[PDB]
Curated annotation (Swiss-Prot), chains A, B:
Record remark: domains: The Bromo domain mediates interaction with histones that have acetylated lysine residues at specific positions. Also recognizes and binds histones that are butyrylated.
Biological classification of the source: Eukaryota, Metazoa, Chordata, Craniata, Vertebrata
Signal peptide (UniProt feature, chain positions): none
Name the record gives this protein: Bromodomain-containing protein 9
Subunit text: Binds acetylated histones H3 and H4. Binds butyrylated histone H4. Component of the multiprotein chromatin-remodeling subcomplex SWI/SNF called GBAF, which includes at least BICRA or BICRAL (mutually exclusive), BRD9, SS18, the core BAF subunits, SMARCA2/BRM, SMARCA4/BRG1/BAF190A, ACTL6A/BAF53, SMARCC1/BAF155, and SMARCD1/BAF60A. Interacts (via N-terminal bromodomain) with acetylated RAD54. Interacts (via C-terminus) with RAD51.
Protein localization: Nucleus
Bromo domain boundaries: 12-113
Amino acid sequence: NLYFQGGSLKLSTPIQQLLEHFLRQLQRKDPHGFFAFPVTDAIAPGYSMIIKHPMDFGTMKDKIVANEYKSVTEFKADFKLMCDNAMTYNRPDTVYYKLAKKILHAGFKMMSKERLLALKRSMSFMQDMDF
Amino acid sequence: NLYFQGGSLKLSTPIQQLLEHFLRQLQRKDPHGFFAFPVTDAIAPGYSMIIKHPMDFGTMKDKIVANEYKSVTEFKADFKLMCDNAMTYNRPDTVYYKLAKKILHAGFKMMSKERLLALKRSMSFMQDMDF
Ligand SMILES: COc1cc(OC)cc(-c2cc(C(C)=O)n3ccccc23)c1
Ligand SMILES: COc1cc(OC)cc(-c2cc(C(C)=O)n3ccccc23)c1
Ligand SMILES: COc1cc(OC)cc(-c2cc(C(C)=O)n3ccccc23)c1
Ligand SMILES: COc1cc(OC)cc(-c2cc(C(C)=O)n3ccccc23)c1
């Protein structure tokens, strides 16, 4: 199943472009990859018993690639689920709890509707120009 | 002469926003301010005899503030006039000649219609989003 356009044989949406950008920036807060892959029962005994809805950055990346996010709010919800899971399974004295708390706070600030509107407004002048 | 809008008493165009940005970046290539002010006959004997149409970054800033640039091409022309003046009055062995040549080449690359189109296209996804 193909189509021909602009001299190229073919077959990335705005939301995919936005979420790919924010996911790369959030994963930079986790240089050791603690949040990069699903938590296994081997590394975290009882995890599958305690945490009913697991989430990780790698699973969110798969959702972006497959174009399964319909809103920023859905992305932020998955992000929040990951951080809440880490702050439920792990004790407050752990790197996982402390990092989840920092990531959750920083991510919600960075992706607020009000902030994205202000960034869009700052960029609008380039769309008003003809080049 | 005033008007009231959005609860504020009033009275910056896309081209003004674009040119203010590029002028700041071009002046960063001239940290000593050699191109920041008109060349005087005191600092450059015979300048007013040799150079018929003087130009400097400070004069270009005044034009931006006064909203006197109708195109990027007009801005690039003033920039080119400044660099050509420096490469006419000064010998090739001078910092002024060498800097003018570097500024001229870098400025034309950075402000090419093709580059600005590509930057506009990279940014378009944010204008397609609703926040
Ligand atoms: C110490 O090295 C690692 C590596 C890792 O994947 C690269 C993931 C984790 C990890 C991540 C988590 C999480 C996120 O809960 N975790 C909980 C208990 C024990 C380990 C982990 C730790
Ligand atoms: C230096 O100030 C700015 C302002 C801006 O929009 C307001 C956007 C950028 C900007 C930054 C970037 C980067 C970092 O990729 N970029 C890529 C394509 C088009 C614009 C930009 C830089
Ligand atoms: C060496 O210090 C300075 C300072 C300056 O203004 C801050 C401007 C110039 C300067 C700038 C120029 C130019 C641009 O032609 N010039 C030519 C002959 C002698 C001096 C200069 C030199
Ligand atoms: C990290 O990659 C990017 C990409 C971008 O547009 C493609 C723009 C920016 C960007 C950079 C900036 C800066 C540096 O001011 N900026 C300001 C307002 C809105 C957007 C941006 C950064």
